[PDB]
Every structure is written in structure tokens, then in C-alpha cells.
Amino acid sequence: GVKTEQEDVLAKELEDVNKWGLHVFRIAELSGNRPLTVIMHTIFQERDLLKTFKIPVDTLITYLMTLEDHYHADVAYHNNIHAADVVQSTHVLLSTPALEAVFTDLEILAAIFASAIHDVDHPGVSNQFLINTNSELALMYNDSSVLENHHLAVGFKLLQEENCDIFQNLTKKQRQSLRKMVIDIVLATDMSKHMNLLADLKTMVETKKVTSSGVLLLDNYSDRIQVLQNMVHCADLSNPTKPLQLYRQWTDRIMEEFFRQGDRERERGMEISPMCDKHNASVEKSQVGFIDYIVHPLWETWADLVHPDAQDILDTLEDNREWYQSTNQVSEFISNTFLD
Ligand SMILES: COc1ccc(Cc2ccc(NC(N)=O)cc2)c(F)c1-c1cccc([N+](=O)[O-])c1
Ligand SMILES: [Mg+2]
Ligand SMILES: [Zn+2]
């Protein structure tokens, strides 16, 4: 029962698991490309989720590895590292002072689990791409939140593989509640629901009410689920709020994925999607537009909801924005992607 040097170096990096700016990419390298499994495992022990839900450890490790295995190793952005990142970011948002003792363990389990399965089996192309190209996934889900429905379905389906049912001991009451919450969360990661998600969050802020000493007050399922929906969505759009070296790597990875889709559209003789033309693109103008028009409005509203816990995160966002600034198709990307 004595760790290797590599297991120890990994163990020391995982001491940053509660910190914004976790070196997530190095955890990927140190675990043998198992960032989702070790981060999920660490977070479950930390939060004591194995004892509360009577999840066998062997079953939990088998599920996490199976789930991770269905993330595509050949996709540059929407892979197990992005999965691990969203999970860990959500875990840090969950721990914020203003939300101390607000959420139940089941709710916590839903948010974390949902973050884990939220992009599983992503082919690295968009919903609209899948729809126009007439893919099976599009036909399967009647052109509605195609990828997002597929992520949920695969995530839940993998519970049935050998020794993978990590919810085998929950009651039906818990399982139905977990399921509905997990579905509501993952479906709300459809980017085209962003303005509707932002509108609700704004309303929640304008009318916000607080309990004894600082803590937020959520009185009904709707308000409770809307915060969790926005929490994971914030985690999904968190790259620009991280330290720059991390942010820069995600930008590289997303653009490679985007150009690869553009390459496939051009091959086919299709109209190339906004920001997917490698010969005609400004990464730098895009990201400034990304922050000004989508990322900053979201995270400012989140910062207002949980004031003042997110100021450092929001400072980092503003700093990174100024860095990129000092370096039409952007408009079209934002309209097509974040509007319904
Ligand atoms: C660091 O850069 C990003 C990080 C995450 C997302 C969220 C996202 C992910 C996948 C899709 N997938 C689709 N549509 O297929 C859509 C949105 C982004 F969008 C960008 C990004 C990239 C280029 C231009 C713009 N911009 O102009 O705002 C934003
Ligand atoms: Mg998604
Ligand atoms: Zn995602």
C-alpha cells in the first residue's frame, strides 16, 4: 500500500482540487490520460459521497473508467480533459461561501455527475452540422438538442455495463429525483439556451433573498434547479476565467476542433460555419467578442448572485480579456450559437 513516484506527484497536484486554476492538463498526463476518473474519485471521497449513497468503490472506479473511455481521445476539445475540467470547476463553484449548506447531497451528486457525463461521446462537430449532414444522431433525436440528448443517453446507458451501476443502492425516490435533475442540467448546456439561462439568472439576482449570515435562499425546485443549471453552464464556459496558460490551451484546442469541422464542410462543398474557416479567422477578435458579449455578462451575474466570492475569478476574466484585446464572423458565431 505504498504509492509510486508518479502516483505521488499526481497526489500532490490533486491537493489543488478545490482551487480555480488546477493544473488539469498535467493531471491528464500524470494519471495516464485518466483526469476524469481521478478527479471524480477525489471529489467523491472529499464530499463523502461513497458513504452517503452506499456506492461500492470498485463499482465507482469501473463506471468512471467506462464513462471516460467513451470520451473521444481523438477530439481536441470535447474530450475527457474538458469533462474533468467542468466537473472540477463545478465542484469549486459548489463550495462557495454564499452556497454553504444550501444544497442537499442528492443535488450535489446531480450537479457533479451531470458535469461528468455532459459531453460524453462528442464527435467534435456541432448540432447544426449533424442536422445538415443528416446524421443518425440528428434523426434519432428529431433535430432537438441532438448532442445533449445523446450525452445524457450514453451517460445513463453506461450504468448497465458490468459492475457500473453506481446508483444500485439508492431508492427509486432518489433515483427518479437524481435523474430528472441530471436531465434538466445537461439539457441546459445546449449553448442555444444561453440567453434564456442568462435571463432567468438575472431575474434571480434582481429578486434575490438571503438567510441568516450571508447564505442564499432557494425555496422551490425551480429556483434550486436554475442555479444548478447556471452553475454547470458557468463551468462549461469557464476557460476564459482561468489563468492564461490554461485559457490559451483551451482556445488552441477549440479552434483546432472548429477548423477541423470547417475542413469537412469545405470538402463537402457546404457553406463554412462561422469561425471554422482556417484561411479567414481571427482567434483574437473572437475571444474578445466571446468575453464581452457572452462570458462576462454570465459571470458578472453569477458574481452578483454570490457576491463577493467570485471577484478573483471575474478579475482574471477581465485581465485575460485585456490581454487578448492587446493582440462580423464573430457576430455571426454568437448569433447562431447562443440564440435560440
Ligand atoms: C475559448 O473559446 C471558446 C470556448 C468555449 C466555447 C463554448 C462552445 C463550445 C462548443 C460550441 N460548439 C458548436 N457551436 O459547435 C459552441 C460554443 C466557445 F464558443 C469558444 C469560442 C471559440 C471561438 C469563437 C467564439 N466566439 O466568437 O464567441 C467562442
Ligand atoms: Mg455541450
Ligand atoms: Zn462542455
Question: What CA–CA distance (Å, rounded) separates 304 from 230?
Answer: 13
d(C-alpha 173, C-alpha 49), whole Å: 18
Q: How was this structure determined?
A: X-ray
d(CA 327, CA 323): 7
User: Among 172, 164, 166, which Cα is nearest to 54's?
Assistant: 166
The binding-site residues of ligand 1, defined as CB within 6 angstroms of any ligand atom, are: 126, 191, 237, 239, 250-251, 254, 275, 286-287, 289-290, 294, 330, 333-334, 337
Residue-wise over 203-220: b if at least 16 C-beta within 10 A, else e? ebbeeeeeeeeeebebee
Nearest-angstrom CA–CA distance, 233 and 223: 15
Class of residue 264 by CB neighbours under 10 A (exposed 0-12, middle 13-18, buried 19+): middle
Rounded to whole angstroms, the Cα distance separating 116 from 129 reads 24
Phi, psi (degrees; rounded to nearest 5) at 47: -90, 0
Binding residues: 78, 82, 118-119, 236, 239, 287, 290
Q: Cα separation of 8 and 50, whole Å?
A: 23
Separation between Cα atoms, residue 143 and residue 140, nearest integer Å: 8
Atom of ligand 1 nearest to the CA of 333: 27
Resolution in A: 2.7
Ligand in nearest proximity to the CA of 78: 3
| Ligand 1, atom 6: closest residue by C-alpha | 237
- The rounded distance, in Å, linking the Cα atoms of 284 and 34 is 31
The burial of 23, by beta-carbon neighbours within 10 Å (0-12 exposed, 13-18 middle, 19 or more buried), is given as middle
Helices (H), 24-135: 24-30, 35-46, 49-52, 57-69, 80-94, 105-117, 127-132
Cell of residue 310, nine digits? 467570485
Which among 3, 96, 7, 87 is positioned nearest to 49, based on CA atoms?
Answer: 87
What is the distance in A from the centroid of ligand 2 to the CA of 191? 7
Cβ atoms of residues 121 and 257 within 8 Å: no
| C-beta separation of 337 from 127 below 8 A | no
User: What CA–CA distance (Å, rounded) separates 272 from 198?
Assistant: 28
Nearest to 126 by CA among 25, 275, 246: 275
Fold of domain 1-340:
Catalytic domain of cyclic nucleotide phosphodiesterase 4b2b (1.10.1300)
**Contact (CB, 8 A) for 115 and 82:** no
DSSP state of 118: T
> Which residues lie closer than 8 Å to 108 by C-beta, 6 or more apart?
47, 49, 94
Query: Distance from the CA of 236 to the center of ligand 3, in angstroms?
Result: 5
User: Whose atoms come closest to the Cα of 287: which ligand?
Assistant: 1
